[PDB]
Amino acid sequence: TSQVRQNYHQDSEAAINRQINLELYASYVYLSMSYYFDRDDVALKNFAKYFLHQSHEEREHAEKLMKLQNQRGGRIFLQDIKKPDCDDWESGLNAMECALHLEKNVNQSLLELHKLATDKNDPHLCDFIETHYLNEQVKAIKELGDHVTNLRKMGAPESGLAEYLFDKHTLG
Amino acid sequence: TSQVRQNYHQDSEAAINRQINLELYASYVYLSMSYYFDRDDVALKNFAKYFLHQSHEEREHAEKLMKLQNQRGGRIFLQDIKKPDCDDWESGLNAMECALHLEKNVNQSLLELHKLATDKNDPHLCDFIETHYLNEQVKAIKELGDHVTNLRKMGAPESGLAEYLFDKHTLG
Amino acid sequence: TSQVRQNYHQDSEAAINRQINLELYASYVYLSMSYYFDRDDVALKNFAKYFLHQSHEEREHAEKLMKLQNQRGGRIFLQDIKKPDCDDWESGLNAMECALHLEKNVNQSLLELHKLATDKNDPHLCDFIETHYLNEQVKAIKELGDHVTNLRKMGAPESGLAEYLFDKHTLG
Amino acid sequence: TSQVRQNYHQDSEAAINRQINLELYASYVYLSMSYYFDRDDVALKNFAKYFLHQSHEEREHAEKLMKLQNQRGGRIFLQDIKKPDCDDWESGLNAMECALHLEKNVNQSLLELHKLATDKNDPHLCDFIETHYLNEQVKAIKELGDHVTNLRKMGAPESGLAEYLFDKHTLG
Ligand SMILES: [Cl-]
Ligand SMILES: [Cl-]
Ligand SMILES: [Cl-]
Ligand SMILES: [Cl-]
Ligand SMILES: [Cl-]
Ligand SMILES: [Cl-]
Ligand SMILES: [Cl-]
Ligand SMILES: [Cl-]
Ligand SMILES: [Cl-]
Ligand SMILES: [Cl-]
Ligand SMILES: [Cl-]
Ligand SMILES: [Cl-]
Ligand SMILES: [Cl-]
Ligand SMILES: [Cl-]
Ligand SMILES: [Cl-]
Ligand SMILES: [Cl-]
Ligand SMILES: [Cl-]
Ligand SMILES: [Cl-]
Ligand SMILES: [Cl-]
Ligand SMILES: [Cl-]
Ligand SMILES: [Cl-]
Ligand SMILES: [Cl-]
Ligand SMILES: [Cl-]
Ligand SMILES: [Cl-]
Ligand SMILES: [Cl-]
Ligand SMILES: [Cl-]
Ligand SMILES: [Cl-]
Ligand SMILES: [Cl-]
Ligand SMILES: [Cl-]
Ligand SMILES: [Cl-]
Ligand SMILES: [Cl-]
Ligand SMILES: [Cl-]
Ligand SMILES: [Cl-]
Ligand SMILES: [Cl-]
Ligand SMILES: [Cl-]
Ligand SMILES: [Cl-]
Ligand SMILES: [Cl-]
Ligand SMILES: [Cl-]
Ligand SMILES: [Cl-]
Ligand SMILES: [Cl-]
Ligand SMILES: [Cl-]
Ligand SMILES: [Cl-]
Ligand SMILES: [Cl-]
Ligand SMILES: [Cl-]
Ligand SMILES: [Cl-]
Ligand SMILES: [Cl-]
Ligand SMILES: [Cl-]
Ligand SMILES: [Cl-]
Ligand SMILES: [Cl-]
Ligand SMILES: [Cl-]
Ligand SMILES: [Cl-]
Ligand SMILES: [Cl-]
Ligand SMILES: [Cl-]
Ligand SMILES: [Fe+2]
Ligand SMILES: [Fe+2]
Ligand SMILES: [Fe+2]
Ligand SMILES: [Fe+2]
Ligand SMILES: [Fe+2]
Ligand SMILES: [Fe+2]
Ligand SMILES: [Fe+2]
Ligand SMILES: [Fe+2]
Ligand SMILES: [Fe+2]
Ligand SMILES: [Fe+2]
Ligand SMILES: [Fe+2]
Ligand SMILES: [Fe+2]
Ligand SMILES: [Fe+2]
Ligand SMILES: [Fe+2]
Ligand SMILES: [Fe+2]
Ligand SMILES: [Fe+2]
Ligand SMILES: [Mg+2]
Ligand SMILES: [Mg+2]
Ligand SMILES: [Mg+2]
Ligand SMILES: [Mg+2]
Ligand SMILES: [Mg+2]
Ligand SMILES: [Mg+2]
Ligand SMILES: [Mg+2]
Ligand SMILES: [Mg+2]
Ligand SMILES: [Mg+2]
Ligand SMILES: [Mg+2]
Ligand SMILES: [Mg+2]
Ligand SMILES: [Mg+2]
Ligand SMILES: [Mg+2]
Ligand SMILES: [Mg+2]
């Protein structure tokens, strides 16, 4: 056993490794989305910048979980990072919708992890999830929802003008 | 009853007084360790500085619990502060090992206190412990573990050179 | 066809997608190595910092290739990022040796890509590889070689003192 | 022979004179486009500014080739600068499309020049073209492509509103 390990269930250790993979997957999804908007036939530079930033934020989320694993005396086990479900993201609206779905999926995983930490009476792990993950998820979901709403109301995806103006005035 | 008291169980009040004593005990252990390294026949000034700082930090932990007791309308009851288990701490490695054991013991007490606060549905007390104690404990335990590891790998306690170089490059 | 595409062979486009995957793989290898050194039973913080920096640099290498793909009118196609070959990296010396092997493998791929670009008379792609990749690879390989040499001469991996002192004086 | 001349083929010298003319022609095309947008019945001041800047950049491209000719000991021979193919550029979208076509034509000429320099084993000339011309061309082509895409998606050229808003938010 690790000399630092205390009140850290093997199930929690495994669940943290699963979450590390999911955060890295989210980073990869946003990386793919970003460069879609950098295509010469899409050409929305602020969509590209927004998603690239989100990609880097997800890598930080993964790194903090790796730090947590070691802090508690668990051992990191990495798996393949799956490619994103799409190569072509269709439109600014469709990418925002996919990002919303992604964030809600990652949120569900975090809630299941918190439930496990509660079941195993691990208040340090509960606090870690609450402090560093749960409100960040709620804010990200709300922001993406707001963006989807704007784009729909402006007439996307059929209006290329709508996506252009949203790119300039909200993401720029 | 105190005019401020609300949702604060007598058992929680007693457990807080027990924790105050334990934090003061930890302060005393680190004070003893510090001056061991200030001995002319030990002479590791950065070990001495490190443990003196830890001693002062533990006094702050005790003071914050005393503040909490009064905030919630409980009444502070103090007990003797027991002398540390050792007069002679043997080596830098042995002191670090004793500090690791101490921090894990104090952590166990904090986890039992959190379990009591949960059992009595006292979310303010739960949050207090999580916010101000539990991650500080996890960080301290990880740091001490890292230090023990370094010292062992460098050849302590038999290598006086190892302890000297660790004193200079990690604690200095 | 893309409106921007000119003198860009389909084979080159495919080879660039292969290189993007390899750079992301290299980023993942260094991420794994970094947190190995953050383990409480390894505890070499400057090895950890060094490899984390290298991980972030590899992500920038991948991003620049994604930018290139779009600049030339090719289309990005992403694949799974394979997990690193090892979970446990053994020692500072062994990790440096694995990093050296990794960088030489990535270099070989870049040289094959340059040979393809030469075969297809694509001087823009040749210049891109030379300017942004080939000397960076040569410098990284030389640095890792120097590090391996130091560690061996100092007595690693058997000397935990050697790895500690290298961590402090070269990587710190 | 020039006292400085070394490894500089007569064919390369002639090809450089041809490129000088083409760069001056490109400068003239952009000058014409610029003042089209300054017409009172067109009135898009940021299109005008953008193309005037591009015109001045092309003159710098020509000047650098003239400097190169003398550096290598060749002799500059100038020809008439042909007037642009159009007097009336129709719309912001049409001008951007013509600029894209122009840049791809100039790129093709640069690639033919690089092929000649390769055939004559003139690595200095190869490096000159790669360093100062080929990536500038790729970037210009990508930028113009992005602009064409935006304008089409926004509803140009039929939407005078689209061209107005693009003028303000992308070129302004
Ligand atoms: Cl335990
Ligand atoms: Cl445990
Ligand atoms: Cl367990
Ligand atoms: Cl696992
Ligand atoms: Cl997984
Ligand atoms: Cl896997
Ligand atoms: Cl699978
Ligand atoms: Cl359970
Ligand atoms: Cl709990
Ligand atoms: Cl949060
Ligand atoms: Cl919000
Ligand atoms: Cl908030
Ligand atoms: Cl919004
Ligand atoms: Cl009450
Ligand atoms: Cl009460
Ligand atoms: Cl009570
Ligand atoms: Cl009491
Ligand atoms: Cl007591
Ligand atoms: Cl007493
Ligand atoms: Cl007693
Ligand atoms: Cl109870
Ligand atoms: Cl509660
Ligand atoms: Cl804390
Ligand atoms: Cl820590
Ligand atoms: Cl932390
Ligand atoms: Cl340490
Ligand atoms: Cl072509
Ligand atoms: Cl082509
Ligand atoms: Cl082809
Ligand atoms: Cl491909
Ligand atoms: Cl691949
Ligand atoms: Cl795949
Ligand atoms: Cl496979
Ligand atoms: Cl070929
Ligand atoms: Cl070539
Ligand atoms: Cl380079
Ligand atoms: Cl070097
Ligand atoms: Cl160099
Ligand atoms: Cl070195
Ligand atoms: Cl010659
Ligand atoms: Cl000559
Ligand atoms: Cl000749
Ligand atoms: Cl001529
Ligand atoms: Cl001519
Ligand atoms: Cl003429
Ligand atoms: Cl003529
Ligand atoms: Cl020839
Ligand atoms: Cl050559
Ligand atoms: Cl260039
Ligand atoms: Cl570009
Ligand atoms: Cl570039
Ligand atoms: Cl654009
Ligand atoms: Cl507007
Ligand atoms: Fe974000
Ligand atoms: Fe951010
Ligand atoms: Fe995340
Ligand atoms: Fe997220
Ligand atoms: Fe401390
Ligand atoms: Fe402190
Ligand atoms: Fe404490
Ligand atoms: Fe403590
Ligand atoms: Fe590097
Ligand atoms: Fe760097
Ligand atoms: Fe790389
Ligand atoms: Fe590399
Ligand atoms: Fe330009
Ligand atoms: Fe310029
Ligand atoms: Fe030019
Ligand atoms: Fe040009
Ligand atoms: Mg998963
Ligand atoms: Mg698959
Ligand atoms: Mg709670
Ligand atoms: Mg909290
Ligand atoms: Mg918070
Ligand atoms: Mg007690
Ligand atoms: Mg006694
Ligand atoms: Mg906290
Ligand atoms: Mg591959
Ligand atoms: Mg596998
Ligand atoms: Mg260079
Ligand atoms: Mg000509
Ligand atoms: Mg004529
Ligand atoms: Mg260059």
Count H helices, E strands: chain D? 6, 0
Measured CB to CB, residues of chain A less than 8 Å from chain C are: 2-4, 24, 28, 31-32, 35-36, 38-41, 52, 59, 63, 66-67, 69-70, 73, 75-84, 87
Query: Does the distance separating the beta carbons of B155 and C160 come in below 8 Å?
Result: yes
Beta bridge partners, C81, equal: A81
Any idea what DSSP says for residue B131? Answer: I
Residue among A1, A4, A12 with most chain B CBs within 10 A, to mutate = A4
CA atoms within 13 A on the CB side of D26: 28
**Strand ranges inside B26-87, DSSP E:** none
| Encoded tokens for C157 | 């991996």
Taking residue C153's Cβ as centre, other Cβ atoms within 10 Å add up to: 9
Amino acid (one-letter) located at B72: R
User: A72, B111: Cβ pair inside 8 Å?
Assistant: no
The distance of A35 to chain B (nearest Cα, Å) reads 39
Measure CA of the first residue to CA of the last residue in chain B; give whole Å: 51
**Whether the Cβ atoms of residue A4 and residue C40 lie closer than 8 Å to each other:** yes
Q: How was this structure determined?
A: X-ray
Q: Do B162 and C161 touch (CB under 8 A)?
A: yes
- Is there a contact between D162 and A165 if contact means CB atoms under 8 Å apart? no
Q: For residue A157, report the phi and psi dihedrals to the nearest 5 degrees.
A: -90, -5
Task: Indicate the residue type of B26.
Answer: A
B124 among annotated binding-site residues: no
Q: What gap in Å lies between CA B89 and CA B96, rounded to an integer? A: 9
| A70 contacts B111? CB cut-off 8 A | no
The residue assigned the tokens 């739960």 is B126
Q: Which of C75, C72, C76 is nearest to C24 (CA)?
A: C76
Indicate the angle between helix axes A10-36 and C45-72, nearest 10 degrees: 30
CA of A51 to the centre of ligand 4 (A): 29
Question: Which of B145, B153, B162 is the closest to C40 by Cβ?
Answer: B145
| Domain span holding position C169 | 1-172
- In A69-89, which positions are buried (b, 16+ CB within 10 angstroms) versus exposed (e)? bbbbbbebbbeebbbbeeeeb
Chains that touch B (3 or more CB pairs under 8 A): A, C
CA-closest candidate to residue D107, choices C134, C129, C73: C73
Do residues B42 and B56 lie in contact, with contact meaning Cβ atoms separated by under 8 Å?
no
Q: Tell me if residue D37 falls in helix, strand or coil.
A: coil
Q: Do residues A25 and C81 make contact, with C-beta atoms less than 8 angstroms apart?
A: no
Q: 3-state DSSP call for residue C133?
A: helix
A4: CATH: 1.20.1260.10
Residues in CB range of B84: below 8 A, 6 or more apart? B28, B29, B32, B33
SS (H, E, C) chain A: CCCCCCCCCHHHHHHHHHHHHHHHHHHHHHHHHHHHCCCCCCCCHHHHHHHHHHHHHHHHHHHHHHHHHHHHCCCCCCCCECCCCCCCCCCHHHHHHHHHHHHHHHHHHHHHHHHHHHHCCCHHHHHHHHHHHHHHHHHHHHHHHHHHHHHHHHCCCCCHHHHHHHHHHCCC
In the structure encoding, which two tokens stand for residue D122, read together? 């003139």
Half-sphere exposure of B96 (CA within 13 A, CB side): 25
Q: What's the resolution in A?
A: 1.6
Q: How far apart, in whole angstroms, are the C-alpha atoms of residue A95 and residue A161?
A: 17
Q: Is C137 annotated as a binding residue?
A: yes
How many structural domains is chain A composed of? 1
Query: Which member of A3, A72, A73 has the closest CB to residue B148?
Result: A3
Our CA-based measurement puts residue C130 at a distance from the nearest CA of chain A, in whole angstroms, of 23
Residue B53: CB atoms within 10 Å: 12
Yes or no: say if A94 and A157 are a contact pair by the CB < 8 Å rule. yes
